[PDB]
Amino acid sequence: DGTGISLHRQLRAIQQLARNVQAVLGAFERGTADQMLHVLLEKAPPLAL
Amino acid sequence: DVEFDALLGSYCNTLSLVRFLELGLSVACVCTKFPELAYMNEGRVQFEV
Numbered sequence A: 001d002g003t004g005i006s007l008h009r010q011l012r013a014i015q016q017l018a019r020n021v022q023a024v025l026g027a028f029e030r031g032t033a034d035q036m037l038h039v040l041l042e043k044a045p046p047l048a049l
Numbered sequence B: 001d002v003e004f005d006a007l008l009g010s011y012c013n014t015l016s017l018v019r020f021l022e023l024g025l026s027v028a029c030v031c032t033k034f035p036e037l038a039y040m041n042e043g044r045v046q047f048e049v
Helices: A004-041
Strands: none
Touching: none
16 A cells, blocks of 8 residues: 555565575575585595495 | 546546535544554544543
């Protein structure tokens, strides 16, 4: 509507996509380092073997 | 389409039209467009005599 609050109800839901999308696109950078430690440990023969 | 409706379908025709404050009940009626009336929980008026 033309009311300022209905314009401001949007902004929380605007910022929530600022906060989800920066998280889940951050999550792949947080996930590559999770994947590399597995695929190092997938081919990591334990020492004293 | 609404650019024509603001010209044609917004005014400049009656064919059977009433305005409220045209009508003479309005001396009974305070009338005030409070647009955020959907958002209110309660609406209070205090009287003190």
